[PDB]
């Protein structure tokens, strides 16, 4: 049933919540359907630069991705550091586009911050270097501070 694979590049966290004394040990957990993926832990850093790829199998245009940040405590429970979700459908519908041969830098669809989504700023779906890309800044919900910067890429699966 597979449509393809979505690469979620988790770039970094910005000003993440402090869940130890003075810092945190954040890792990101991403869920979609029954799939559950996580980045590595970055030690003692509220602006962790993960630059890390998570790969999800996609069977559905109508699916939502959930992202949760936790602070790893080796010898105890891990505290919540906020969560956000986002839609992939706009990305997916832009893939089915007749896109090929547009100038690099070309902005194709734009998703706007709403009371209902987690975007800290409008999300540009861009056609660069022969690939369709979506960049996101997600404002974490349920926490006193924190943002996560991610980028979507698509992998065809023959
Ligand atoms: Ca802790
Ligand atoms: Ca910790």
Curated annotation (Swiss-Prot):
CC cofactor: Ca(2+)
Protein residues bound to Ca(2+) 1: 19-20, 71, 73, 79
A single GO cellular-component term on record: plasma membrane
Task of the protein: Mediates the transient calcium-dependent interaction of PYR/PYL/RCAR abscisic acid (ABA) receptors with the plasma membrane and thus regulates ABA sensitivity. Stimulates the GTPase/ATPase activities of YchF1, and regulates its subcellular localization. Promotes tolerance towards salinity stress by limiting the accumulation of reactive oxygen species (ROS). Promotes resistance to bacterial pathogens (e.g. Xanthomonas oryzae pv. oryzae and P.syringae pv. tomato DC3000).
Location in the cell: Cell membrane; Nucleus; Cytoplasm, Cytosol
Disulfide bonds: none
Lineage, uppermost ranks: Eukaryota, Viridiplantae, Streptophyta, Embryophyta, Tracheophyta
Keyword annotations from UniProtKB, A to Z: Abscisic acid signaling pathway, Calcium, Cell membrane, Cytoplasm, GTPase activation, Lipid-binding, Membrane, Metal-binding, Nucleus, Plant defense
Main location as per UniProt: membrane
Keyword Manganese: no
Record-stated family: Belongs to the plant CAR protein family.
InterPro entries assigned: C2_dom (IPR000008), C2_domain_sf (IPR035892), CAR1-11 (IPR044562)
Residues reported in the UniProt entry to bind Ca(2+) 2: 20, 25, 71-73
CDD domains hit by this protein: C2_ArfGAP
Protein name: Protein C2-DOMAIN ABA-RELATED 4
Effect recorded for residue 71 to A: Impaired Ca(2+)-dependent phospholipids binding and reduced abscisic acid (ABA) sensitivity, as well as altered membrane localization and PYR1 binding
Species assigned in the record: Arabidopsis thaliana (Mouse-ear cress)
Residues covered by the C2 domain: 1-104
Effect of inactivating the gene: When associated with disruption in CAR1, CAR5 and CAR9 genes, reduced sensitivity to abscisic acid (ABA) during seedling establishment and root growth regulation.
Subunit structure: Dimers and oligomers. Binds to PYR/PYL/RCAR abscisic acid intracellular receptors in an ABA-independent manner, both at the plasma membrane and in the nucleus. Interacts directly with PYR1, PYL1, PYL4, PYL6 and PYL8. Binds phospholipids in a Ca(2+)-dependent manner. Interacts with YchF1.
GO molecular function term, any single one: protein homodimerization activity
Database matches in PROSITE patterns: C2 (PS50004)
Gene Ontology BP terms: abscisic acid-activated signaling pathway; defense response; positive regulation of abscisic acid-activated signaling pathway; positive regulation of defense response to bacterium; positive regulation of response to salt stress; response to salt stress
